[PDB]
């Protein structure tokens, strides 16, 4: 319902067939069984790359919080390289 959003997000499961393309998505943030950072959606789940993340200050980024993630998918592994988060 936000004014700015009329770009559109993409469900997680629709990220299998593309790579080297920027996207936008949101969902639960938690730790997978293995112990890595993952985002969960009713469609599915992916992994998170954090090594070069610049978050929006003023928020308590906590597991269990809805977050908006902008990044680049990479099919070589399964890492959604994040560059911004709010």
């Amino acid at each position: 319902r936000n004014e700015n959003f009329q770009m559109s997000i993409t469900p997680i499961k629709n990220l299998l067939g593309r790579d080297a393309q920027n996207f936008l998505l949101l969902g639960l943030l938690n730790k997978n069984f293995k112990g890595n950072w993952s985002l969960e959606d009713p469609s599915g789940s992916v992994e998170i790359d954090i090594s070069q993340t610049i978050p929006t200050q003023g928020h308590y980024y906590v597991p269990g919080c809805m977050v908006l993630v902008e990044g680049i998918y990479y099919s070589v592994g399964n890492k959604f390289h994040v560059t911004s988060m709010t």
Binding site: L16, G17, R18, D19, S75
Partner: protein, 201 residues
């Protein structure tokens, strides 16, 4: 346009539909003039669909199936006309398609006997009938397009190409162009073909 990939196959079909000229010499007899192409590949890779498209696109074409045909009934038949009470030759399947194209499906699933007849019509493009007091040579200058399955369920890329095919080399060397199609499993191609198919439906 509804078939994804296989660009070189489309080019081969285009070149085959309008093949080269015939050559006849007062001393050199005759030289074959058109092109023949064979398809062997793993199941469900859109060979029959392309063959059906070739059926619809070409001017004159006849459809045959390996299991649904008999070699003797494919070239000529000895039947008696009702009004005259005289037995006269009845034109066979591929004779009707002279100068046209004949498409065969399940080619390797045909009875071996019929195969020898094919070799004859691939040798000098002429079939001879000598039976029941009739001796006649019939002209048949048609081109053949066909598709066949490998001996196993799927093509084995590590084996001898002759090991994967059930047809003898005697008639396989006759065919000008042989194509091998295999559905390599790549997620990018999977997504692309999925988009195309969903666009079609």
């Amino acid at each position: 346009p509804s078939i994804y990939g296989h660009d070189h196959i489309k080019k081969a079909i285009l070149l085959m539909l309008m093949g080269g000229v015939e050559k006849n010499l007062e001393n050199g007899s005759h030289l074959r003039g058109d092109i023949n192409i064979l398809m062997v590949g793993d199941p469900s890779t859109a060979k029959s669909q392309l063959l059906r498209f070739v059926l619809n696109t070409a001017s004159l074409a006849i459809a045959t199936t390996g299991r649904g045909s008999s070699g003797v009934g494919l070239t000529a038949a000895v039947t008696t006309d009702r009004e005259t009470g005289e037995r006269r030759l009845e034109a066979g399947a591929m004779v009707l398609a002279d100068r046209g194209v004949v498409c065969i499906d399940e080619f390797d699933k045909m009875t071996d006997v019929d195969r020898v007849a094919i070799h004859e019509v691939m040798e000098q493009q002429t079939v001879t009938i000598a039976k029941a007091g009739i001796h006649t040579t019939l002209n048949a200058r048609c081109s053949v397009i066909a598709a066949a399955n490998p001996v196993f369920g799927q093509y084995d890329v590590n084996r001898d190409p002759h090991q994967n095919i059930a047809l003898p080399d005697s008639l396989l060397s006759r065919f000008d162009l042989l194509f091998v199609v295999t559905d390599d499993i790549n997620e990018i191609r999977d997504r692309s073909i999925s988009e195309h198919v969903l666009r079609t439906h």
